């Protein structure tokens, strides 16, 4: 799980970590109200999408500084209810239904601080750098010496001397190294309490008054810990039906069991000239309702022109696909590839029982089929004709 920026900043507020004062506006009129409550002058508008991209209304950038409540209402007008489009969102984007209207802070010096579980250290690591306010991957490549990592023993917890030493090496002035270390210790407590996989604060900053303050907060949570994180995980229908699903920009459906095989199925589709439309892992214990909801999810996208299902187990799995195809009135080609118990009886099931479903044995064979069938559909749409398939035995 991940929360909106404001949901994060609320968590560090409850932990004593100082955060710029801000309130959430879900409409342009309440952005005016929040801006007036802040002084009706320098006010920051931060879009909350789950930031340096382009909105659908033409406005580029998600964070804007305005100088009047009237301007705060107008800038939030082109944000709330509109979609943002960044490189991480693909051809589509994320909807913005609310903005964070917080106070403007005037920083002296920006640092970078992060707490993450690194596999190279087999535990939590504190990351610090004097090069804050910028992208962290570019400095890791330009000047890796500016990045300082301090591992934390999971049993003994964080030591005050660890956070103090990192703050000095990060370049904090000596008069506020302690308050910077106290913030870092408070963040490690938040890191373990909510089962976060990474807490990134870019930038951690010194106030114009000299105080240490966290301007931005990105928190990623371990979804495996949802059972013991009721507060966090209470804040499309894939999750509703409990299926590992991620929509992509492609046009070829993908229904696979096993996360590795599902990524491999996406790769082999791209290898044969196609574009995968989604990642989906039905995994073990897949009932008939899973594949029906899996099909309903893939076919919920109009751009999907073909569906390749690749399951390694076979008659009972075939009957579940046949049932879902007939109920949803699926008219796009479906190429199935089943390995397991009864391949001969399952291949005769889909073939000798009605619907136009193609069954393949080889993974490359099924990949070429679903790509060629999608291109036929593409050509039929471009030619503005409808094509009906007739399949061999």
């Amino acid at each position: 799980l991940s929360l909106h920026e404001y949901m994060s900043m609320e968590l560090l507020q409850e932990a004593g970590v100082s955060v710029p004062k801000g309130y959430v506006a879900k409409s342009p009129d309440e952005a005016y109200a929040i801006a007036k409550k802040l002084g009706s002058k320098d006010v920051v508008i931060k879009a909350q999408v789950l930031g340096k991209g382009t909105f659908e209304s033409g406005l580029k950038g998600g964070v804007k500084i305005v100088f009047s409540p009237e301007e705060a209402k107008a800038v939030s007008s082109q944000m709330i209810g509109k979609k943002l489009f960044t490189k991480q969102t693909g051809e589509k984007g994320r909807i913005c239904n609310q903005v964070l209207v917080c106070e403007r802070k005037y920083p002296r010096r920006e640092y970078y601080f992060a707490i993450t579980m690194e596999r190279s250290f087999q535990g939590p690591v504190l990351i610090g750098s004097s090069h804050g306010g910028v992208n962290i991957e570019d400095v890791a490549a330009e000047s890796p010496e500016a990045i300082i990592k301090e591992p934390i023993d999971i049993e003994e917890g964080i030591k005050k001397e660890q956070a103090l030493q990192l703050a000095q090496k990060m370049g904090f002035p000596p008069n506020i190294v302690e308050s910077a270390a106290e913030n870092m210790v408070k963040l490690y407590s938040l890191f373990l309490k909510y089962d976060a996989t990474m807490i990134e604060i870019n930038p951690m900053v010194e106030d114009s008054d000299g105080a240490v303050l966290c301007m931005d907060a990105k928190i990623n949570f371990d979804s495996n810990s949802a059972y013991r994180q009721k507060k966090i995980f209470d804040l499309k229908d894939a999750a509703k039906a409990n299926l590992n699903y991620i929509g992509l920009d492609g046009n070829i459906g993908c229904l696979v069991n096993g996360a590795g095989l599902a990524m491999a199925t996406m790769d082999i589709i791209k290898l044969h000239g196609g574009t995968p439309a989604n990642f989906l892992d039905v995994g073990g214990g897949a009932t008939v309702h899973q594949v029906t909801e899996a099909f309903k999810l893939i076919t919920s996208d109009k751009k999907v022109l073909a569906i390749l299902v690749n399951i390694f187990g076979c008659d009972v799995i075939a009957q579940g696909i046949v049932m879902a195809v007939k109920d949803l009135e699926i008219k796009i080609p479906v190429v199935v590839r089943l390995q397991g118990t009864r391949v001969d009886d399952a291949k005769a099931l889909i073939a000798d029982s009605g619907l136009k479903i193609l069954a393949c044995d080889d993974l490359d064979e099924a990949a070429r089929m679903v790509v060629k069938l999608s291109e036929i559909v593409t050509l039929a749409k471009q030619a503005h004709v409808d094509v009906k398939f007739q399949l061999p035995i």
Partner: protein, 305 residues
């Protein structure tokens, strides 16, 4: 000394005796039924509160220590639910079980970091997993959930971070009549007990293993670490051919791909750098997941094997 001293416990054989932690549960009972029908010496199991009972004609113990003492088991498989599976691993480590295979997926990453802290400070217990299909010696021993129907005792050692994708490779190697010497699924979690290098040390020292198939994916640096290991210990003359496939070149960054360890974050963990590193180490990387059986085949023919 070093935890790498327990690498030898990965190679189960016909003499390996297994107890099932989580014997009474639905998942533990189901796969224990199969391990008996496959021919593996599943000799007991543990379930707190049900010690002394008889499950599938086999003794049920309350703790792992009682099970190991009264059965002489040298291996353990874990089907405990994620809320308690990490404690099940810790119990087996303290019982000094030589090999423990944790099949459970969904264990909190913070729990495994704690388990990793304890595991790395001992020699007796070697951990496979969690979130792994297990280890199988075709025709001798089978610990886990892999379908032994597709395995044939052969010459290729397989180590993979995936489950069903591992089965696809096993089926491909069998369809070309090569077979498998030892298959180890190290799981798809970010903090596990066995990496690629641990299995490569076993494969490169196994006379029955003439070829190796490494199946990886996005996330982490274990593939790059394996590439450096192979370049220093499997180069020049009398080297064993390694054929690999990395999944996730089409994966979007910053998204978890089912597996808890399949993630591209901060510009690290991409599949392109892993393919680039393995190729530079001499590993033949197959671009299609359907050609790993044929790739290791013609890699054997180019050396008259």
């Amino acid at each position: 000394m070093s935890y790498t001293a327990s690498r030898q416990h990965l190679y189960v054989d016909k003499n390996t005796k297994i107890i099932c932690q989580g014997f009474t549960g639905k998942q533990g009972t189901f796969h224990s039924q199969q391990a008996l029908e496959y021919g593996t010496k599943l000799v007991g199991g543990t379930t707190p509160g049900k010690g002394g009972q008889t499950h599938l004609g086999l003794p049920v113990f309350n703790t792992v220590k009682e099970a190991k003492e009264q059965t002489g088991a040298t291996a353990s498989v874990i089907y405990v639910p994620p809320p308690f599976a990490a404690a099940a691993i810790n119990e087996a480590i303290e019982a000094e079980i030589p090999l423990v295979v944790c099949i459970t997926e969904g264990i909190p990453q913070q729990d495994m970091v704690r388990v990793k802290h304890k595991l790395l400070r001992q020699e007796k217990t070697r951990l496979i997993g969690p979130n792994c299909p297990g280890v199988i010696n075709p025709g001798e021993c089978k610990i886990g959930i892999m379908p032994g129907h597709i395995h044939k005792k052969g010459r290729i050692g397989i180590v993979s971070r995936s489950g069903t994708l591992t089965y696809e490779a096993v089926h491909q190697t069998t369809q070309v009549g090569l077979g498998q010497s030892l298959c180890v699924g190290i799981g798809g979690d970010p903090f596990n007990g066995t990496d690629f290098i641990d299995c490569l040390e076993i494969f490169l020292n196994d006379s029955a293993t003439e070829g190796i198939i490494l199946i990886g994916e996005i996330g982490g640096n274990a593939e790059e670490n394996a590439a450096e290991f192979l370049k220093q210990h499997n180069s020049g003359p009398n080297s064993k051919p390694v054929v690999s496939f990395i999944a996730g070149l089409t994966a979007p960054p910053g998204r978890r791909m089912g597996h808890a360890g399949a993630i591209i974050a901060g510009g690290k963990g991409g599949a392109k750098e892993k393919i680039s590193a393995l190729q530079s180490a001499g590993v033949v990387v197959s671009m299609s997941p359907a050609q790993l059986g044929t790739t290791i085949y013609k890699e054997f023919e180019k050396r008259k094997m």
